[PDB]
Design a protein around this ligand. Structure first.
Ligand SMILES: [Zn+2]
Ligand SMILES: [Zn+2]
Lengths: 536, 813
């Protein structure tokens, strides 16, 4: 532990003999100098650093898997990883592991570009001011990828559970009256009649004499599994039975992807078991900063939670009563200035509670009444991959606290090996309005909605003509891994919490139901939830 | 209560859907009463009968027309069940399509401001205890004299600022104690305020002011004096005249009232909502207070509205109220949606629609612009009331068409407004101006995007008809932009213009579809060199000369004066050529055919001298401060030779004449020979060094002027202020609307349609590698176009220091 400085020329023979000779590692002058400095700092007389260099090279070969380790980041990375492995074994560090290094939140622009190779692969893809703009091919494939993922789910689940297969639409032409089962995106043609779209082609369907599954919501834009008899005389598929593709468990996707490491998995499991007491507090929907009664209720809730600040405090969409827009007036209506003053008032009313907002991360989710997402949509269902709240309105709010995150509306969290998806949207109203009837209580409706959402494998299985989506940022909405915890914030749906297919779904509902500031609480270690209704 | 107008209908809901304040000016004194109003829903029983009858019988089919894309469901308490009775069984609460109109709004639309409770003494006493239910009481009455005669005021003007001076001032009708060397300047303004008060007494006849204005100089340092002192003062004023005054509150932000002052001033309220030099503002505002009181009296006398109408664009509120009245006279549903700028189109207004989104961001107005030199006398006639005349003359399946029934209702409303404006009615013409400025207002309580799109298209076609009429009249059009028209009369002689102009304008006025259209000649151009709105020059009335050349800003400072000087030289050349041609006589060939020869030798001699000068000083330092290309918002072209840019600009401006095209091309070729550059060389080809970034449908918040504000071509003086007036514009509003157009373009690019690359057939499916004709799919809005738009926005933000625009750019990436 004696600090000292050792020069690169003397360590060069031994360093070479170890890294290059022993395992084939290229060493540069800068990396050699930095490693000599590190060795001198963590050992004196520079004799028994051979184990240290061996640990460095073995970790580098096991994780990095390249050459030329002397780049100041391979060296630093391996050094730090050695630090955490020494820490978990309980040198340079002998402390304990912290969940902050294993807790993170992912925005729509920070996800991993997972494009599924149609034959068999789920590849990874990962430049200027206008560098984020999606390309035309992305608009082409935003539904190609959804089709391919749902097809993988079908050919992994249905055939092994139920084994007559899927016939491509293109291959339905010459067959006269045979029985067929199609996995196709239900839609209405430009002619105004119902049909199914598929990469092989599209087929118009005789929706009459069809019996669907009653535990699902069916809308234009969701992909279904129809079955029936084709007719070449009218070139129409007389469908008799239809259902949504069956869902799959999260571990079923994890074993396919094969993405975790073993030591990382053990550390995450150890932290999950040890961190038994961690509280997540979810606020309701429509936290209107303009409504004075809402600030009264929010002050009461903030005081109550200042007694025991939770681990996380998520803030949901539509922070103001009126949708924002370019407001023309000579007064302070000026919805930008009004929204900034609303955040300033929130900061003033929120800085009053020092125990709160400390040792607690608060995340803000945009909604239908938020800047840069509502200023053009005018309170309508605009772009689904909503960008984070602009920092131009968050000067005072962020200045008050130390851990404030403004995240995407369909954001992802990697707090542990589990993934938590936050999503604020009134999906129930859209589903009820757009549900097509069939010529052939509340908990049942919520079950149908959740089953549709999970079986479709998409956050919004809707046509882009019904809800626009950023073409490149579509994997952010796909439920490919089926992560366990769904923060399905909604305002037109009753508050509930249900589990299915190894996935947990919570709808805290609107912040104010009748007279109470409803908010929600969750314990990940027990994976147990509880409502919190507080009277005004 | 008997034929008594409530001055304020302030929402005294108390959690009861229908209980509210009515400060009706009873015969003795104003009295506060409670009401009871059921919430009518317009849910028409479209081919489905529900015998449910929860609380109130619901009218079947509503006997009304829905909104394509006498009180049904008159429930008392909607809060019984937020789920209501949702069935989705052939339009029974399946699509709301009703009225979100709460109390204080349904009353104004249904019950007139003046009303009389037509019940016996016992029934009146019974209704006093609980309130006046609108079902059996509060029937509308005539508004011959809706306002009062003489009533006390509560003038409490306040103009806060961050400099350090507090304007927490209170004024009383008789107290005259304005609590804030102000007396001397107060008397200085009083010198004309004696005449102002004489005007008030002969025109307003409402209140009078004491002449002993005493000024209380107290520093409102903290809330102890900011609010608590103000709170005790206002409660003392309230108890002075017990519910016997009207508060006149002036405050940019109203929250100070709603905290504790609002319930301290339950007497009727009017919210104006508007260092030594700043001291004059207080005296001007207090001494102008007695002017608009009679204006509000007249407005409430004509329009059947209480005195509670919020003063910020109160005429928009008047429009909404009057249109709601006229639509309730008709049997048509409404789309109020007071809470949101969106209309109340049931529940379907909250989801994305291609047609609705497109008609939101569809503001591109066609422009006619012809670049050239025109020796003919051309007249600059400025149009006005184009929207008013369009909606008036609009009388003379389609899912994109607005409701023609509501269109006819609006047409009749505008007809009565117009022929009231013909007679003595200032309210009428103010209202027609407000309706012109109001259709495109999202804040409107009855705004509809389809209506705005329809009005825009009608204005477009009316302008097309006007252009055709002028073309038939015998005067070609070189500019037309919905605000002014440049007509090229064939009358060469400037003298033979006035009679011809009068005949032309009379002929235009004879047109029935343009009878309400008003026009006036702005300037007469015997000679004019025209490219665009911001790049032109010429002679105006024949003696004055103008030169508005934005491209001159794109030249190096050494060559800008040379550009200007040679421009006047060439202008004098064409002027002399035209004069000589007219003298000899008195387009294939016009008066100008050899005007270049007047400066040919001097032009290329000076070009050679400047070329030698530049070559001497192109590389030597201390001259690069002259050979420097200025940075402009529209800068997108790299200049390697400022002299070459100068000569290209002159060549482009002198190529405008169609008759002299050959001689101008020869002169350009000779000039390029000095640079040893080929005549048709791509670098020798001139292009516009300035891009464009227009803000469509910009409205001036004072004169209600509709304009399109460019930034990459319009001068900075022409963007921060209006044209017809010189009042400035809000920086926040400019940034808001620029970001609005930016995000609208982003969304339109993200929601564009695909089409084939070979036969150009639009893509109609979702799963298709290419067109069935083997044509690759492609978007209509190129990504490069959006890249250029983003670059233009970033350049504008950096040049003008637009902070919020730069924040938006940072948010993008
Ligand atoms: Zn103006
Ligand atoms: Zn094609």
């Amino acid at each position: 532990v004696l600090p000292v400085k050792i020069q690169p020329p003397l360590l060069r023979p031994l360093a070479y003999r170890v890294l290059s000779r022993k395992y084939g590692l290229s060493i540069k002058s800068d990396g050699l100098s930095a490693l000599a400095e590190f060795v001198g700092t963590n050992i004196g007389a520079n004799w028994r650093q051979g184990p240290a260099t061996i640990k460095f090279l073995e970790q580098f070969a096991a994780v990095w898997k390249q050459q030329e380790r002397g780049l100041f980041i391979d060296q630093s990375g391996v050094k730090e990883v050695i630090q955490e492995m020494k820490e978990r074994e309980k040198p340079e560090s002998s402390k304990a592991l912290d969940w902050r290094d294993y807790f993170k939140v992912i925005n729509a622009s920070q996800q991993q570009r997972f494009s599924y190779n149609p034959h068999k692969m789920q590849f990874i893809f990962v430049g200027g001011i206008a560098g984020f703009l999606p390309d035309i091919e992305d608009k082409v494939q935003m539904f190609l990828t959804r089709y391919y993922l749902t097809n993988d789910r079908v050919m992994r689940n249905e055939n092994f559970q139920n084994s007559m297969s899927i016939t491509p639409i293109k291959n339905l032409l010459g067959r006269d009256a045979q029985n067929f089962l199609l996995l196709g995106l239900l839609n209405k043609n430009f002619k105004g009649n119902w049909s199914l779209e598929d990469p092989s082609g599209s087929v118009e369907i005789d929706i009459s004499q069809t019996i669907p599954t009653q535990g699902h919501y069916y809308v234009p834009g969701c992909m279904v599994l129809v079955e029936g008899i084709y007719y070449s005389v009218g070139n129409k598929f007389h469908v008799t039975s239809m259902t949504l593709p069956p869902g799959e468990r999260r571990e079923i996707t994890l074993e396919t992807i094969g993405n975790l490491d073993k030591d990382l998995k053990i550390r995450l499991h150890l932290l999950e078991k040890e961190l038994t007491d961690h509280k997540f507090v979810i606020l309701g929907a429509n936290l209107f900063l303009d409504d004075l009664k809402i600030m009264t209720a929010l002050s009461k809730i903030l005081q109550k939670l200042n007694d025991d600040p939770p681990t996380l405090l998520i803030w949901q969409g539509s922070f103001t009563s009126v949708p924002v827009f370019a407001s023309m007036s000579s007064r302070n209506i000026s919805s930008s200035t009004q929204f900034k003053n609303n955040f300033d008032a929130l900061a003033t009313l929120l800085s009053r509670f020092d125990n709160l907002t400390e040792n607690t991360t608060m995340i803000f989710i945009p909604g239908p009444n938020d800047l840069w997402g509502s200023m053009v949509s005018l309170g309508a269902s605009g772009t689904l991959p909503q960008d984070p709240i602009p920092s131009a309105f968050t000067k005072k709010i962020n200045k008050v606290c130390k851990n404030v995150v403004w995240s995407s509306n369909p954001t992802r969290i990697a707090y542990l090996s589990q993934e938590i998806v936050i999503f604020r949207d009134d999906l129930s109203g859209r589903f009820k309005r757009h549900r097509l009837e069939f010529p052939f209580q509340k908990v049942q409706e919520t079950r149908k909605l959740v089953k549709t959402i999970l079986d479709q494998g998409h956050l919004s299985p809707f046509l882009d003509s019904l809800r626009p989506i950023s073409w490149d940022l579509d994997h952010t909405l796909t439920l490919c891994p089926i992560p366990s915890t769904m923060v399905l914030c909604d305002t037109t749906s009753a508050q509930f919490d249900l589990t299915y297919n190894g996935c947990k779904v919570i709808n805290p509902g609107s912040f104010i139901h009748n007279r109470r500031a409803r908010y929600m609480e969750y314990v990940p270690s027990s994976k147990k939830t509880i409502q919190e209704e507080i009277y005004i | 209560y008997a034929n008594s107008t409530w001055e304020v209908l302030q929402y005294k809901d108390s959690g009861e859907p229908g209980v509210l304040e009515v400060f009706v000016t009873i015969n003795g004194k104003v009295q506060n009463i409670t009401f009871h109003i059921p919430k009518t829903i317009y849910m028409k029983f479209k081919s489905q009968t529900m015998p449910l009858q929860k609380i109130k019988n619901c009218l079947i089919e509503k006997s009304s027309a829905s909104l394509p894309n006498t009180l049904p469901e008159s429930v008392f308490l909607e809060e019984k069940e937020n789920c209501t009775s949702i069935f989705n069984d052939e339009n029974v609460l399946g699509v709301f399509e009703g009225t979100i109109t709460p109390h204080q709004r349904a009353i104004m639309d249904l019950g007139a401001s003046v009303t009389f409770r037509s019940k016996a003494m016992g029934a009146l006493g019974k209704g006093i205890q609980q309130g006046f239910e609108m079902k059996d009481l509060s029937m509308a009455e005539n508004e011959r004299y809706l306002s009062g005669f003489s009533m006390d005021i509560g003038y409490l003007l306040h103009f806060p600022t961050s400099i350090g001076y507090e304007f927490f001032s209170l004024f009383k009708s008789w107290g005259d104690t304005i609590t804030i060397n102000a007396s001397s300047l107060g008397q200085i303004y009083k010198q004309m305020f004696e005449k102002k008060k004489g005007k008030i007494e002969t025109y307003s006849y409402l209140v009078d002011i004491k002449e002993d204005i005493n000024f209380e100089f107290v520093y409102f340092t903290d809330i102890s004096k900011l609010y608590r002192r103000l709170s005790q003062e206002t409660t003392k004023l309230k108890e002075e005249r017990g519910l016997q005054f009207l508060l006149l509150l002036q405050s940019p932000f109203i929250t100070k009232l709603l905290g504790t002052i609002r319930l301290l001033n339950q007497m009727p309220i009017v919210k104006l909502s508007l260092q030594p030099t700043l001291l004059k503002k207080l005296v001007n505002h207090v001494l102008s207070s007695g002017s608009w009181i009679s204006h509000l009296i007249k407005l409430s006398q004509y329009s059947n509205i209480p005195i509670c109408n919020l003063r910020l664009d109160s005429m928009d509120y008047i429009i909404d109220v009057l249109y709601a009245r006229k639509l309730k006279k008709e049997n048509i549903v409404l789309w109020w949606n007071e809470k949101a700028p969106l209309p109340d189109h049931g529940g379907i207004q909250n989801d994305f629609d291609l047609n609705t989104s497109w008609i939101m961001n569809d503001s591109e107005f066609p422009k006619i612009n012809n670049s050239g030199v025109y020796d003919n006398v051309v007249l600059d006639v400025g149009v006005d009331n184009l929207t008013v005349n369009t909606i008036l003359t609009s009388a003379l399946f389609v899912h994109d068409a607005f409701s023609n029934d509501a269109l006819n209702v609006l047409r009749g409303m505008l007809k009565e407004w117009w022929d009231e404006a013909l007679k003595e009615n200032s309210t009428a013409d103010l209202l027609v101006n407000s309706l012109a400025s109001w259709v495109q207002n999202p804040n409107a309580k009855l705004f509809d995007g389809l209506l705005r799109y329809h009005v825009h298209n009608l204005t477009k076609k009316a302008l097309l008809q006007l252009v055709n009429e002028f073309s038939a009249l015998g005067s070609t059009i070189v500019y037309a932009d919905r605000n002014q028209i440049l007509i090229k009369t064939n009358k060469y002689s400037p003298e033979n213009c006035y009679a011809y102009s009068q005949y032309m304008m009379k002929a235009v006025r004879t047109n029935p579809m343009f009878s309400y259209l008003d026009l006036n000649i702005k300037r007469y151009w015997d000679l004019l060199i025209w490219m665009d709105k911001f790049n032109f020059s010429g002679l105006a009335c024949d003696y004055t000369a103008v030169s508005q050349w934005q491209l001159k800003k794109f030249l190096s400072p050494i060559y800008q004066p040379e550009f200007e000087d040679w421009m006047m030289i060439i202008l004098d050349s064409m002027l002399k050529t035209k004069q000589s041609y007219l003298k000899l006589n008195s387009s294939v060939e016009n008066s100008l055919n050899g005007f270049s020869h007047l400066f040919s030798k001097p032009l290329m001699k000076r070009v050679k001298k400047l070329f030698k000068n530049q070559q001497e000083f192109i590389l030597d330092p201390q001259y690069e401060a002259d050979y420097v290309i200025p940075v402009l918002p529209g800068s997108h072209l790299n200049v390697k030779n400022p002299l070459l840019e100068l000569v290209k600009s002159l060549c482009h401006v002198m190529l405008l004449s169609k008759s002299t095209i050959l001689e101008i091309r020869t002169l350009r070729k000779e000039l390029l020979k000095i640079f040893e550059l080929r005549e048709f060389a791509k670098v020798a080809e001139f292009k516009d060094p300035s891009l464009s970034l227009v803000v469509p449908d910009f409205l001036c918040e004072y004169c209600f002027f509709i304009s399109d504000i460019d930034f990459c071509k319009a001068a900075p003086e022409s963007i921060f202020s209006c044209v017809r007036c010189h009042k400035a514009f809000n920086q926040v509003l400019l940034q808001e609307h620029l970001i609005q157009k930016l995000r609208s373009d982003i969304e339109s690019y993200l929601i564009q349609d695909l089409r084939c690359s070979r036969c150009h057939k639009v893509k109609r499916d979702y799963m298709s590698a290419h067109c069935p004709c083997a044509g690759a799919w492609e978007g209509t809005l190129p990504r490069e176009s959006i890249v250029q738009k983003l670059n233009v926005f970033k350049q504008v933000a950096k040049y003008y220091g637009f902070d919020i625009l730069l924040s938006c750019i940072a948010d993008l990436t």
